[PDB]
Design a protein around this nucleic acid. Structure first.
Ligand SMILES: [Ca+2]
Ligand SMILES: [Ca+2]
Ligand SMILES: [Ca+2]
Ligand SMILES: [Ca+2]
Lengths: 336, 334
DNA sequence: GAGTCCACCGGTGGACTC
DNA sequence: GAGTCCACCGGTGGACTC
C-alpha cells in the first residue's frame, strides 16, 4: 500500500516483489545484484491510490514525498528480506524515480481528463475529492485524451495522414541533401479527442490505482490515437524531469523548437504549448533558460517562448488544478 | 607517471595524492568518503605526456584506454593505501572521466595549434612525432588560439565589444517582451589569433605535460581573448561527451543553433563550424540526430552540427585537427 | 535467456563568493 | 570555513525480438 505494510509485503508472490534478487542469475556487462521492479513498486504503492484523487492527506502532501514513496517502500522490503546483503546503485534509484515521476504525474492527468470529459458529455462534475467546477460550457467536441508516450516514439505519428505527408515532402527533401529534421517525443501529449471517439466511454472513466492492468491501459493509449490528430489538435506537450541540472535542460527546449517549426511554420497550427515539470529546479538558471524564444519563429520574421513555463508542483492537488485550469481556458478555442 | 609507479606514488606529498581521504572532514549533505583529486590525477598520469605528442606507443594507443588511465591509476593508489575501505561512487568516476576526456583532448589540440602557429610564422614544420606538413601557405595572420572554455562561460564574451552590443541590443529587445535568447558555451573554441598577438611566442610553444601550471595556462587562456574576437574569427567550436545517451545529445545541438542564428543571422559570419567528439556512440541514433539542419537556416542550408567524431587514437585527433586547419584557414587572407 | 536499444537522474571536484 | 553553483556521465528497468 502507500504506507508500507509488512503484511501486504509478505502477501506478495515472489515475482510481485519490489526487489528482485538476481545474484544467481547475472547479466552480461552488468554487476546488478538486486533489481528495483518499477512496475511492481507502482502496483504496491499506488495500487489503490492516484494522488490528487485519494485522501486529503495524500492529495495535499509534498509531491516530492509522494513520488519518493515507491523507492522508500522497496528499500524497506529489500532490507527486511536481505538484511546486510541488500544493495542497489544510486543509479538504479535514479532511473526508477524518474519513471515513477512521469508515470504518476501522467496518471493524475488521466483522471483529470476523465472527469473533464464526463463533464463535457453532460454527465455533471464529480465531487470526490472536490475541485472547483470549470465554467466553460460543456461540449463533446471539447473532450481530450492524455497520452503518455512510449520510449522510442516519434510524435509525428499522432498526426493525420495528410499532415504527416506534408512533413515528409519536407524531410525527404532535406535528407536527399545530406541533412534532415528528425523528431523524437515529449514525455506526454494532450490532444483533442477525435470526433470518432467522442461517444466512447473509456475516455471518461477514472482509474482507482496503478495496477498492472491500469498501467497498460494508460501506457498503451497513444496507439488508439495514432494517425488521428489534426495539427491544431495537439493542445499540450509535457516533459517531466524529477530534478534539473544545467546540462539536462535542452532536449525539451530543442524538441519544442522543432515542434513549432513543423506545426506552426509548416502546418499553420497556432502556438504550440509545451511545458516542463520538475520537483527540484536546484536554483534559478532553469527558469531563465526556459525564457528563450522559439528560433524558427525568430529567424523567419509574432514570436513567443519555445517553452511556456517551468512548473514545480507542490502537491498532486495543485497538478490537477493546474491542468483543470489549463483545459478550462485552452478548450474555449474549440468550437464545441 | 602514465604507467602506474609504486615509487612515484610513494614520493608524493599528501596533498598531491590522487585519492584524498575525507572520512574525518565530511562535505555537508554528502556521503563521500574519498575524493578523486582530478587535478592531481592529471599531473600524475599526464605530467610528462601529452598523447599524440609523446611515444609512438601512447600516440597510437586506443584513446579510450588513454582517457581511462587516470581513474585506473587512482583506483590503484586507493587500493594500495586503504584496501577494502577504498570506496567511490560510479558518479564520481563519471564526473572525473568527463573532465579528463575534455582536458586531455584540448591539450592535444593546444599542441596542434602551437605546431601550426610555428609553421605559420615561418619557422618551418616540427617533425617529432611525424605528421603531414600542411599545404596551406604560411602567414602570421593564419595563427589560431585554442580555448578550453570554463564552467559558467558565455561564448558571447569572446567577441569584440561592437559585436557584443549588437547582440545585447537584440536580446534586450526580447526581454522587454518577456522573452530571451541566453547563450551558454561549447567546451572549446578555436579562434583566429588577434593581430595584437601574432608575434607572441606563447601561442607557438608545445607543453610537455599536464602539470598544474600547464593545466592553468590552458584553462586560463580564454581570458586573454575576451573582447578581442571578430564574429567570423570563431573558427570551430567543439563539445566533448565521453559517452552518449539519447537524452544527452541536445545541449550541443541547441547551442549550435543559437550560435548560427547570432553569428550568421545577426552578425554576418560565414557558416559556424561546430562538432561533437565522443568515445562511445552506443549506436546510430546519435549520428542521425546530428544530421539535423540548422533551424535558422530553415527559417531563412547546412547542418547545425558538422560531424560527430569518434577519435580512435590521440594521433588521429591531431591529424584531423591539422587537416581542419589546412582547409578552414583558407578563408583567412595571408 | 540473451542481445540491443531507449531514456531515466543523482553524486560528484572544482570554481567562485562571502 | 562553509555555502552555492556548474556541468560531468554511467548504471540502470523495461520494450522488443528471437
Ligand atoms: Ca513515457
Ligand atoms: Ca522526461
Ligand atoms: Ca572546460
Ligand atoms: Ca562537454
Amino acid at each position: 500500500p502507500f504506507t508500507y505494510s509488512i503484511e501486504a509485503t509478505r502477501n506478495l508472490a515472489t515475482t510481485e516483489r519490489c526487489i528482485q534478487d538476481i545474484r544467481n542469475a547475472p547479466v552480461r556487462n552488468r554487476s546488478t545484484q538486486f533489481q528495483l521492479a518499477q512496475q511492481n513498486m507502482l502496483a504496491y504503492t499506488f495500487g489503490e491510490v492516484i494522488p490528487g484523487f485519494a485522501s486529503a492527506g495524500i492529495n495535499g502532501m509534498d509531491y516530492r514525498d509522494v513520488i519518493g514513496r515507491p523507492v522508500e517502500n522497496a528499500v524497506t522490503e529489500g532490507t527486511h528480506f536481505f538484511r546486510d546483503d541488500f544493495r542497489v546503485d544510486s543509479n538504479a534509484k535514479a532511473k526508477v524515480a524518474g519513471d515513477i515521476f512521469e508515470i504518476v504525474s501522467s496518471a493524475v492527468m488521466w483522471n483529470c481528463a476523465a472527469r473533464w470529459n464526463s463533464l463535457m458529455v453532460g454527465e455533471g462534475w464529480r465531487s470526490q475529492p472536490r475541485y472547483s467546477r470549470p465554467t466553460l460550457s460543456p461540449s463533446p467536441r471539447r473532450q481530450v485524451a492524455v497520452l503518455n508516450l512510449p520510449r522510442s516514439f516519434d510524435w509525428v505519428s499522432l498526426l493525420v495522414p495528410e499532415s504527416q505527408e506534408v512533413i515528409e515532402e519536407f524531410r525527404a527533401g532535406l535528407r536527399k541533401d545530406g541533412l534532415g529534421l528528425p523528431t523524437s517525443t515529449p514525455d506526454l501529449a494532450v490532444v483533442v479527442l477525435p470526433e470518432e471517439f467522442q461517444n466512447d466511454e473509456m475516455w471518461r472513466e477514472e482509474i482507482a490505482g496503478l495496477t498492472r492492468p491500469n498501467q497498460i491501459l494508460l501506457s498503451g493509449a497513444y496507439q488508439r490515437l495514432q494517425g488521428r490528430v489534426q495539427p491544431g489538435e495537439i493542445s499540450l506537450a509535457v516533459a517531466f524531469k524529477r530534478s534539473l541540472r544545467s546540462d539536462r535542460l535542452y532536449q525539451p527546449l530543442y524538441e519544442a523548437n522543432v515542434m513549432q517549426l513543423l506545426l506552426e511554420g509548416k502546418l499553420g497550427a497556432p502556438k504550440v504549448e509545451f511545458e516542463v515539470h520538475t520537483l527540484a529546479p536546484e536554483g534559478t538558471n532553469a527558469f531563465v533558460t526556459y525564457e528563450a524564444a522559439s528560433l524558427y519563429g525568430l529567424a523567419e520574421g509574432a514570436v513567443h517562448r519555445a517553452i511556456r513555463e517551468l512548473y514545480v508542483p507542490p502537491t498532486a492537488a495543485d497538478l490537477a488544478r493546474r491542468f483543470f485550469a489549463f483545459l478550462n481556458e485552452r478548450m474555449e478555442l474549440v468550437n464545441g
